[PDB]
Design a protein around this nucleic acid. Sequence first.
RNA 1: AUAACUCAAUUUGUAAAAAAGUUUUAGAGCUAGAAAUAGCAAGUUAAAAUAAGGCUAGUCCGUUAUCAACUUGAAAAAGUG
DNA 2: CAATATCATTTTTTACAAATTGAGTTAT
DNA 3: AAATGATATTG
Length: 1315
Amino acid sequence: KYSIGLAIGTNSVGWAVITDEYKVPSKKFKVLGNTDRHSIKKNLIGALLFDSGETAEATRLKRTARRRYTRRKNRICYLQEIFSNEMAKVDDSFFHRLEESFLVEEDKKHERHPIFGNIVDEVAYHEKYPTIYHLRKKLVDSTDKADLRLIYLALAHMIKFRGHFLIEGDLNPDNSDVDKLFIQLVQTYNQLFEENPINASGVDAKAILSARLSKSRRLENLIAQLPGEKKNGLFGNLIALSLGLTPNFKSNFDLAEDAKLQLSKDTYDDDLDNLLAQIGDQYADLFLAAKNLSDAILLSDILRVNTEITKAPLSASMIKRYDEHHQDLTLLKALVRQQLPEKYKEIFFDQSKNGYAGYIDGGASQEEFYKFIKPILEKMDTEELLVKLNREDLLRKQRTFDNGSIPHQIHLGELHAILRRQEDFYPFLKDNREKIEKILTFRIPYYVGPLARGNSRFAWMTRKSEETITPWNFEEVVDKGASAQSFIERMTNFDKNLPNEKVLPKHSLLYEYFTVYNELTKVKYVTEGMRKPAFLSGEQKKAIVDLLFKTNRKVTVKQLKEDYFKKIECFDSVEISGVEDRFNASLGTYHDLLKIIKDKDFLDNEENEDILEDIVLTLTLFEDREMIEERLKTYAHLFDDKVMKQLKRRRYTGWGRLSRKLINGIRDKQSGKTILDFLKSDGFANRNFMQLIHDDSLTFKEDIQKAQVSLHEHIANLAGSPAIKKGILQTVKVVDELVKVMGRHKPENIVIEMARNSRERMKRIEEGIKELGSQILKEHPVENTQLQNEKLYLYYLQNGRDMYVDQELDINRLSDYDVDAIVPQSFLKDDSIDNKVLTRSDKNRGKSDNVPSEEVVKKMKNYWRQLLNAKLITQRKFDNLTKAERGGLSELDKAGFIKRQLVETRQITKHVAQILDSRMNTKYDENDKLIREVKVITLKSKLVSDFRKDFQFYKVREINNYHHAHDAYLNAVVGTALIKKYPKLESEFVYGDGKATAKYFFYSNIMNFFKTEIKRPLIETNGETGEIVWDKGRDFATVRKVLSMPQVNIVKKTEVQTGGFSKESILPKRNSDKLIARKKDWDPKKYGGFDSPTVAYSVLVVAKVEKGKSKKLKSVKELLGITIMERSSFEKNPIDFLEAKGYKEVKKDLIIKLPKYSLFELENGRKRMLASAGELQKGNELALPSKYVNFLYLASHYSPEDNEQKQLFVEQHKHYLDEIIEQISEFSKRVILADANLDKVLSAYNKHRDKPIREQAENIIHLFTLTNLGAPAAFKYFDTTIDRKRYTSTKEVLDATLIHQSITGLYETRIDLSQ
RNA sequence: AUAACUCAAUUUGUAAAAAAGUUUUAGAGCUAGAAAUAGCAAGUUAAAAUAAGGCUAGUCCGUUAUCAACUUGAAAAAGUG
DNA sequence: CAATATCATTTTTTACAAATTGAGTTAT
DNA sequence: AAATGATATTG
């Protein structure tokens, strides 16, 4: 008797219930609470609306950082523990004055001067050490005994801001011998290149290299001093190396493969190896001369001082930045006094102005500050100050956005230095030097994570002993292995088939053997002789594997024929059937081990297997070469010191799909042969892995099917956005109430259907243009936000050049060229950067009816490549582009994509359909097979779109939140209709278990049976059953009646607010009540803090409150906003929370919980939704008539007969313009109550009545954002901006009726807040 | 529609780190002048907090997910038209 | 009161697993 | 990244 249609979005679930004549019922429903009404009638259509679900990511980023704050606090707390004993002797309360450094003098327990607890000393420290850097250096360099306090402060500053750990092992600054180390690179070259010596020539390398310009600038200016040596020359590339670049030595040496190196990458030693054994080991002394100059220059950018004058070249570089800032501020003051004194006070007094004033004492960035005085500096006479502003080096602060470069190794340098200096004087610095370094040095390894003890959901790390963990006991108390293993194993899959067993590493030698055989087992070959194509033999496979697979990393078909079938079966010709072009499967790990263990006969020897199957496990499981080393010691006794050294470096990542048991472990009872056996030799039926697992005449399928074995949990475990699994949950909870509503009778059919920047874009270009060698950036600069222009972005991802016709393009002309689609938008409704292309006109592509022509694919393929290489096109885009050189689009492929246009395949959507089927269908028949009482029909949103288009049931999202419902009812309809007509299409749309040309002609014309002509009968019917499917004479009318129905059940899901407590920004002090204490003890009148708390939810307090001096109790009803922070508290004692807010004799059993979007009905059926105890959003949907909806589509939308008939429905029904404004006004006036806005809106319309009919409709659409449900929002009529009329009080709600709604909003509880 | 391989792209989830930013305090401002107010001098650094907090007290946890009403439940979740 | 403007912590490195999509191979 | 609720300012 009935079916459901769902529309499942990320913000909405629309639903609808339909009967056999496509009618949607209308029932009377009980109405609870203390009201007038004991019932209502409710059309059985509606929506649920809801705020987007959100990802863990914010949550997690905030958590990982919380852990960072607490471990650094804890860094300091270690250092301090150490000084405590001997600091007591010097100063009684140093570490005290420091903690209360934040407190105002009034609240300070100790003297207001941190360091020396008086004025005269403190004032002096500062005069002698303006910065901590000045102290850092003095303590490092001076031999003099230093104040224990001054030592601690510098050790703390180094340990509090220790800089990154992105480099491994030790770093020893050598910035002096660069003018030699260059004259050594130049010489070992000139030696090798006997014929073309480079002229050292007293070129200042040290300056041009130790310079403050980009690596790619320093290369230009350094070969600029080398006569007739290009930077694309060998010496030019080598130099790019020494300046931590990635060059491509490939055309230098005449190779045919990317020989790019990078000294900082871990693979350099094995990339260099691959090159030097392509070009010769006479070129080793030239990558030694370029590693040599690298270690003196690695850190120019950061150190900027000769490491002859100091062992603290950082602090010194900062003292410099500082001194420079003195000299340069002195002069800049004077210069302004002279030439521009009129403005001086602005530059140095006014904070809001981005002057030096706003720099230091405002909020002005270096960049803003620098961007402000650009003009000022060059409208005066100075030259060197611009020099500096350009080098971003003008009035530099010591602490800045860019001290990120600084490795810890260099802080540890000075940290060490100092300790080493002062342990001469302080015995406790001697005996704990090593302790104090490891405070700086220690770091919990990412593969251990939280150091928990039972109360972390997050942690996995396992304890070797039950101590408190510390930087100095970590190794001995934390079992690092088991935790490294855990970090990985906990995430990696079990075998779906043997669910007890863990998946093998992707790079497992057996796995590679499995993978290969399973591909070798269906290879077929034919010769002029044999009457049929054969399978490979046991002995032939082995022979292939021996000679081809275990010597070529990659075996080609042209190697199968020429290197096996030729040389071992004397076949001049052969026809291979299983594999195309080359073998997917490869013995990669074999060849890698082969190189490293230099012993073939070991790998081959099947008794070693177990060991080689653990070696590779360990190479996958761990990534710390220390732990790999440890693991691999039990195999000391097999291979040289040198082989172990280069077996550690070898790492692997990735995990199979299958266990060791499944492959080579399980036996057939009959055969005592394993899957690996069956692949390796199955005589005559060279059977597959799929097969072996399904052939009922082998053991392997019962041996599997043996080991086999909540709603909210099930859905949150799917793979989608959490945004779209929020929808999946509600679409179920909806479908349950819609059953409950139909008195627990199950639909005959449920019809589901689901919906479908600038940073990462300039990184894709910048890099693409570099990894290409092209001037277009430096020649037409852009910015993050310009590239959002689709045509602009394209033009740049095509290096300012036509994608079909090698010739330049004019940046200034895009608006004349074409963004053509590769596979055309009449097959694939893909409109991403992957299927899109700028050309001066689409034509040039070739035929409109297919992929780009063989002409173009010829001419251009050389170009496209270079874009693939520059990552300025994906593999996918490359492959589609060129596809015409494999016949392009096959009549079939075509018919393919046009059935994909209506047949959902997206895995997330199948899981919805499966979930529903499995809840709807639970009953079994005599033969104990599932009975399917409910067909879950799934559609694409196209079917209905075109429906709406063809029969004019037009959709204008903007009007109201109704379409969500309409689509779900159109789904229910078309859905039930399609399968009523074409029962055979069940195979595709329903859940459960030459001809191309027709499949296409069919799937393209499926939705015909609705049309009267294209000639079809008025009444339609299933040719087989004789069942009526449609009736052009009275069904369309029922669609138009439903669509037009004015009461539709729209329902904002009410949500208690979660997340951050308030706005993060920490505001000054002010004498406000709004300011919130950043800590319990920190009165924000004195110390400032937080503002704008989020309201978790509002609460109706009726109570009494004291009024005036004598303390008369005045009664009050009002909403109190309970803040996220307050909630824990409020919940644990609602009475006490309100009492210590002022409230008294609170009526505890009148306290109504009011989440966000709580519904109230007021005076003229006017409704308002709660936003907060403090504000309301619009509560009313405006059911515009469909004759007005229809018009507004077409009007706004500028078949030629149809076209004429509809531009002449527009011109003839122009009166509707004034009529629609009216609907808006009667409404805006009745329920919106934005009088002054509404009279701008009326005034705005009246001035543009002389404007085109298209333009005016396009804008009457912007006017609906007045009348829209939810939060008031700003909008433009034409030019006129209409700012949002907000509802900033919640009083009128207190005397309204609260409406408690079901998901569907069919069952209600109405409460008349008259209390 | 399923399973294994291959290549690319994408998404979800986790851990370990870094540089800033922001907030109070500390860096004697000084000469007029009763005063409000002038002139001039200074500015780059640091201590500490970075969800309030929590008990399970860990170098842990503290922003995701889930949520009308009524009866039932610690809860999840059931029952009610 | 209720109109009206201003406001919102930013970024960066490393390490890892799982799904998913879509172009190919081989199968149930 | 908007947009929407907080907030101080304003008329």
